[PDB]
Amino acid sequence: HIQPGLCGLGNLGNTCFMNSALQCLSNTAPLTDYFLKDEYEAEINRDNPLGMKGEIAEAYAELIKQMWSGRDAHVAPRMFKTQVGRFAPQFSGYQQQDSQELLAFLLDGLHEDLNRVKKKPYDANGRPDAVVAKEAWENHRLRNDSVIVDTFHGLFKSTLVCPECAKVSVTFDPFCYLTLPLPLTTVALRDCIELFTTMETLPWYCPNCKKHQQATKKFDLWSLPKILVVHLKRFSYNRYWRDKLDTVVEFPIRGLNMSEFVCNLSARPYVYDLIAVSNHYGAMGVGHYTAYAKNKLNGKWYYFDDSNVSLASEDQIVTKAAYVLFYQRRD
Amino acid sequence: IQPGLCGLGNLGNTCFMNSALQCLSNTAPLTDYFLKDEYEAEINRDNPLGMKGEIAEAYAELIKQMWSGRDAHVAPRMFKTQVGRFAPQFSGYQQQDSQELLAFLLDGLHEDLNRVKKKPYANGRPDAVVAKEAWENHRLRNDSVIVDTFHGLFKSTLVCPECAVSVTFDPFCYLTLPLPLTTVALRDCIELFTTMETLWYCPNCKKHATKKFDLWSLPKILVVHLKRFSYNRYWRDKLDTVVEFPIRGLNMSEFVCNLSARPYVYDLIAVSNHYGAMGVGHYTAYAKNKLNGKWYYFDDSNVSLASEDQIVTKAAYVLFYQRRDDEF
Amino acid sequence: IQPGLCGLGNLGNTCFMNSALQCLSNTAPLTDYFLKDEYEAEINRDNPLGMKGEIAEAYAELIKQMWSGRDAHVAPRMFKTQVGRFAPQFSGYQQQDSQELLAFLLDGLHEDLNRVKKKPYGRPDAVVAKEAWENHRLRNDSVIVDTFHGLFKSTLVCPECAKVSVTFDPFCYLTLPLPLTVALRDCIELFTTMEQQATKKFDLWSLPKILVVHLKRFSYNRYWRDKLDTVVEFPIRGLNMSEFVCNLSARPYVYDLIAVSNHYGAMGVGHYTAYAKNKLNGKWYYFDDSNVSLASEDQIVTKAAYVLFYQRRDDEFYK
Amino acid sequence: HIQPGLCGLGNLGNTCFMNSALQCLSNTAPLTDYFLKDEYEAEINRDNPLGMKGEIAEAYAELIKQMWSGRDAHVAPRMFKTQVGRFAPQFSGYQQQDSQELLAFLLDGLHEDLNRVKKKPLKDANGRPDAVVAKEAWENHRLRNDSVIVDTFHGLFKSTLVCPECAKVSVTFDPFCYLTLPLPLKTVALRDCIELFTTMETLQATKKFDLWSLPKILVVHLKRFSYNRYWRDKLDTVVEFPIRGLNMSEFVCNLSARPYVYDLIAVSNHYGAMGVGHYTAYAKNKLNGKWYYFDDSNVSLASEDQIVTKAAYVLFYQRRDDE
Amino acid sequence: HIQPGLCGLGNLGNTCFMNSALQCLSNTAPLTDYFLKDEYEAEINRDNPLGMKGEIAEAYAELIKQMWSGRDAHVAPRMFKTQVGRFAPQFSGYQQQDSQELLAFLLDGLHEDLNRVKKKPDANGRPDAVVAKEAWENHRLRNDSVIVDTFHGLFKSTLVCPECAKVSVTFDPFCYLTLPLPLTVALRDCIELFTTMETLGEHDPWYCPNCKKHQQATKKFDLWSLPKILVVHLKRFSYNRYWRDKLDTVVEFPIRGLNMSEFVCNLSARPYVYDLIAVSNHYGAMGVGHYTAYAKNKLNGKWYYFDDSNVSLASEDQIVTKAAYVLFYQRRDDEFYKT
Amino acid sequence: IQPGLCGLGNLGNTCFMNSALQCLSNTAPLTDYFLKDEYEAEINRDNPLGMKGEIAEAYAELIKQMWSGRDAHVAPRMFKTQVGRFAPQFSGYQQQDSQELLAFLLDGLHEDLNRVKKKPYLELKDANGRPDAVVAKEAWENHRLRNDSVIVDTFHGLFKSTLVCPECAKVSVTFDPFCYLTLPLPLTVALRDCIELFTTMETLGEDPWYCPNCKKHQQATKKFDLWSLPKILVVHLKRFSYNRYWRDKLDTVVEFPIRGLNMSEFVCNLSARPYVYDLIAVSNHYGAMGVGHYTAYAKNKLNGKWYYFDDSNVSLASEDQIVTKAAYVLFYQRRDD
Ligand SMILES: [Zn+2]
Ligand SMILES: [Zn+2]
Ligand SMILES: [Zn+2]
Ligand SMILES: [Zn+2]
Ligand SMILES: [Zn+2]
Ligand SMILES: [Zn+2]
């Protein structure tokens, strides 16, 4: 029969953005394995006031089992589409959609529906970064503990400097994806990462001023997850229209060394390999989303264009169409 | 940007429209008519069968944008709006048909550009005499750039089963070819269309037959619609049969019953494609650029260089052929 | 505020409805019937052709508001809601037709107030017409029949056979075709001119207390609506209908104008207004949605005139 | 044929508010002349993050060319209406609309779609003269905003705040493209409304507005509407305004400034007491100098004695540039 | 923790008509057992031109498994409602709905989505037994499903031409009985009214083969063979131009031992004794209106009232009221009823 | 037909409205006010916080129909239309809340019938360390200088709020009016347990209180106290929790008296006359999931019997049916003597 995971997703009326994001998540082996192991039932959180009563996790679990059964070449994700439209109506209709916006929604929704914290409970003052980061991560896990935290969550350092009182505010914050700005001739992914970590003048509230100030902000990468989701910020949502950057960003297929951008000098080496890409086409109108993904069982690359699954070659993956990159850490 | 290499943005389930529009855009006698920009005197705003010249004007405006060489892609917003206003069946989010839109547009453009300001209003006689009469009568009601570009004549012979022969010559602006009841040739579908098939209100007997179609005269631009869709109670079915059609040198003289007629050799200029089978579905187009002679693939906003070896597939739904004219 | 001098607020493209409602408001036999407030016994809630008495009730309520003398204008929200519920085609911001709403309302009010609880299933013209009218009233008996219903003769002459088939049919308004400034009598003559396969000629037999004359200005084409802008000259006083009445033993028929439904707007959605003569003071007013202003007779006859309301003179005794 | 500019606009379902605003702008000669000269194509800004990719300027230019061709007595502004409802869906509703709200949208929209500043780059002046601080404020405004809209409708007003504790006088100069005038409480003159706008409000500091520089085209919005939680209120006060010779010089603070005499060119009118209401316009035709009444598709000759009524909502004045 | 089958259905905005019909079908044991035993999987027909590509059968199977799992006290039938609306959009409006109209749609839909026939291929003066056997066999050569096996019966149609006096007899299948109500009545009076001869009205005249003309012929129905599950629809609604009328007549019907044998014209037929299993109820008359259901649980033999999401224990004395609209009867198949 | 025994037709998911309307209909001081038909002089059409008198007029018309004795049921079309026009959130086929409608209607009726034609502005006195009796009297008088209507006279009470800052230990005491009490349910319970829980001190969570001495949003302690109670006490049992993606519902059986509810022990004011209440109406909710359904129990003022109002259907009830998990909003009438 059909090879497991080589399953297209039927377009049900401008759901290409959803399908693209779903193919990327489907080919995230730690996440697919978790659901296929079918022991996640004990972790479904139906009372969580921030979740969807376990219903997003259940519709997702059902769909992945279909996609990895080896019985179908394609499935129509009707239950999943219905559940998304019910909890997040902004994803329904026939206007311009965003694979990253849906991805952010799904990563948060799966996390709360599978959150092991049944009751959520409820300040760097020149202390070492290692101490402040450990504290921030532990406090994060006291509120958020799931397969999503274990697979996609990392930690970044935020430094804010007030222009009035010159007070330097350092915080450690979790992330489940990295939104990379593109420079304003092709660019390298490392240039986009360096741009993300370079200081920029913003507005946030200063605790000493008590007012909103146009403070400088600098990001630093502290710890990185098993699955690094890299969002290339191509879209600009202006008041009356959406802009798109068509720049070719060169990104490695294999051996992405993240270690040079990690400010923790005592940290483990971070080498990553590409597993999936969410692609966008269409300078004008609604546009279209597809995906490249590496099948975990045979190690080959494929193109997923809604219901159509075709064998791909690595030389096709790096184009201006690349929008969201999925990287898996080599452990 | 090269003129005519202009993608059309999808405005929400508008692929059916964009596909049809790319085929019409790459119909040189029609595009040249609008780009010559002298058609303003021919806009018919009083025609009771037209859309007050508004479909012709929205189409003229879009073509000028598509052939300006200023844009790589255009969102056909005014055109989409005007279509939805006059023909609301094309504005839902349900499955659409590139041919249904094409038939609407060909009729609408004809009426909005009909030179006839006031429309006025057979038995054992020679075919040549009856055909000349039917055509002259047609142009006394219908005279436009659409009649000049796409209209042909087909002979219809109906034989009564009780009293035993009614011959009529009727115009057409496209040919809907039935597919046989898997790879078939275009010529087999043409032969199927012209074969006598028993099913009409007869005047001699009055007891309401063996209908037979014949091709009499063919136009500059022959639009060939392959009847792939069928409509079941709860869903639309699609025939996925591969129809083999020539890219160059389609000899239609072979199927023309007028033996004194001019030779009819056609070359492919555009194809409306359909993918999806029994699911939601998507339309694209192949079109040969009149200025550089190369084949391009138009997938909504995206325009990419194509090769001839990609064109003949099960995806081919509507074929556009241009007649070879060397002092005929 | 003088009773009846009440404007109707526009509730989003509802001027067509207000224009129609102002003409009916200023039809004295109909308004008096609702103000008399004894019509409650005549509301037919089981009629399969009616709206369970709900259009009559919404209309009665609105007319009482319009003739109370307490308001200069009212927003006919309940009426608009009830119309939109039973006839959803009258909902939206597309081009509307005041005659289409009028025809709906005249039929609706008739069925909601129909006294017939269970509808049953070579002679001289006078005998056949009397029979046709009595049979019509055995199915249809209401204040609308009493105020607006007339009878017209249909003569069909068969060729080859030469058989003359005569029928008498009721009407509650006359749709008059326009020729091609024209006179109303030319449009009446055009309606009565002769046109299996046979010749058909309309003739007017008996005419009602309130004659509603619809000038067929609109042509609904496949993709657009056409409009005839011809100035139709119609009398304000003394319309003699007697010359078009084929019953030679019939009473004289002289009418006086009481209301006009007006339409403006060459392109787009357009706008409907009304001229109406107030029954209590005899003056002409212009009803433009919520605005009611004193009018002069010299303003009434224009290309804007679309539907004319005429009241028969029952002054001198006839038969 | 038809006289250019005497073109009605068809109602496309509750679009009278739009037609009224459009007739006022159509009869603003410096703006219509700019589009009819048809050289504005080089000024269309398609990359502006605050614009509509040039599409509101293009839909407006196309419509104004139709209205001033002399070929049509009326046009249905379908493309314009469609583009407006696409960028600003609040105007594509079915509820009571505001011609001033559409005007403010369109003035900003046209400015951004025609903004000469391709890359946009709070300063307080301490003890410096008003003339120096105002010149600075205007130059800084034009470094961000440079269009036919700035050149036609933009003025500058002075804002003075004085602290009741330390007696500190804080002066700022801010641009405007129209004046929203409050109407008095307890028939009023336009000058009373202007004086009310420039009178010091006790507000914990006192705030006073002053007119510094005035544009070629002065748009005066009479604040008739009050948007309450469940309903909109309307002031029916008759505001007396001059048709010719409005002397604005008395309200201008720059005492070294040029005289400011204005003539009325257009009025946006509003009617209706109970329902959706209706908008029309009075406008002076620039080619024959006569007054006309534009009621959607209908254009009729008007007289000066008809303009000043309670219906007057938005007034358009044109400065006399005699020398 | 919850008893299987005692599962309410959430209202998803005017869907009470749908919940009511679904509770009746859910409590039809031969149909529920078919889905719970996974007998449906191999029989899903996806190419049938008269079906919904197996999608209505799949959505129904999934829902019935949820209702009979014993895990939920109530479920929101979102997937089912979505699939129904997609194939039959008339059921997704906010206008008044009809549980019988949904039932007829669903019985036909499931039949076609589960039809074992993958490729679908006068009778005068002959005995009724011969013609009926032929009509049934020809029916099953086209229609072979769990729906045919559970709900299909056969009725005799006699048409008599008023001109040539030609008597045309046909045997036609049915999956429910629409009973006209007389102009408190007994169910047997409604059955007798259904089998009484009536003269045809326009625009449905009978085409006479002798006359070769459309005729105002007489039409008489007779019951020939009855199914395991007899669905009896009391025709309470009248669709008028501007509103829907409703007959509020109390129809007295048995809860147990309904003897159908007296209305069966086949004298050699097996006895037909039926017990009520479910009732689709309607309240509201000519106003908006609400649908509920009475159903007998197959595992404990008790009567329950299903009012959307709410399931409560009922008593037999509550069942026979003016609210009864659609009745579900189950035939007795013991040693007492041999053929 | 007995007056007041009038059902309300459902006009498409309007059960939430009919339930609230049946409770208000059977509030004798309010129905008597409209039936006396002298309220016309009190309709406030200029109030910027009202609906130009239109909600009061639509309500008056409906209550006269329901108490005429001519109809067994009425379709409240004008009322539903007016509600949908001023508050569009109450239209549609999604889950509704009878208390949300009730709160809207109580405020709308108050503003449409507000005797204060021009609302004044006066500073609220510091009320620092002064006796509770003095500060409460001041708060009530200031409330009536802005709000004076049949709604204030029938449903308004006063509650005391004590806020204590965790940084500066500042004790802020205020008295605020209420037209209903939202009672929290413990995380079968008695009504008195929910009343006691409403007056227990709680610490504000992740909604802090602004402090005047700190000049910052502080997570202070908040304690409520009942000061004065109205003629008609509307008790809202807080069963629903509106979470980001779903609505939670507490199905706890709250035991509440039908007769003799002694409120005096929960009133921190001792100068008040005893407060004894009797149940007059209950708004009920059914439907664990989906859209759900609302009905009402109500005691007829003319015959003293209990009835069940399920949209258009009105049937005789027994007291033993009223106290169930379905009870959501309770209407209590004070004993006067
Ligand atoms: Zn600071
Ligand atoms: Zn024949
Ligand atoms: Zn004859
Ligand atoms: Zn100071
Ligand atoms: Zn016969
Ligand atoms: Zn403090």
Residue numbers in the entry:
A (entry chain C): 296 to 417, 422 to 483, 774 to 791, 796 to 924
B (entry chain D): 297 to 417, 423 to 465, 467 to 483, 774 to 791, 797 to 805, 808 to 927
C (entry chain E): 297 to 417, 425 to 483, 775 to 789, 806 to 929
D (entry chain F): 296 to 416, 420 to 484, 775 to 791, 807 to 926
E (entry chain B): 296 to 416, 422 to 483, 775 to 930
F (entry chain A): 297 to 483, 775 to 793, 795 to 925
Paper text:
USP4 is involved in different cellular pathways and targets a variety of substrates. A tandem DUSP–Ubl domain2526 is located at the N-terminus of the protein and is separated from the catalytic domain by a connecting linker. In this study we show that USP4 requires the N-terminal DUSP–Ubl domain to achieve its full catalytic turnover in vitro.
The two fragments were coexpressed and purified yielding a minimal catalytic domain (USP4 D1D2). The structure was refined to 2.4 Å resolution with an R/Rfree of 0.178/0.21 and good geometry. The D1 fragment contains the thumb domain and part of the fingers domain including the USP signature conserved sequences ‘Cys box’ and ‘QQD box’ of the active site, whereas the D2 fragment completes the active site with the ‘His box’ and the rest of the fingers and palm domains. This zinc-finger ribbon (observed also in USP2, USP8 and USP21 structures) is in the contracted ‘closed-hand' configuration seen in USP8, which was proposed to block ubiquitin access. In USP4 the position of BL1, BL2 and SL hinders the access of ubiquitin to the catalytic domain, suggesting that the flexibility observed in these loops is required for the dynamic exchange of ubiquitin in and out of the active site.
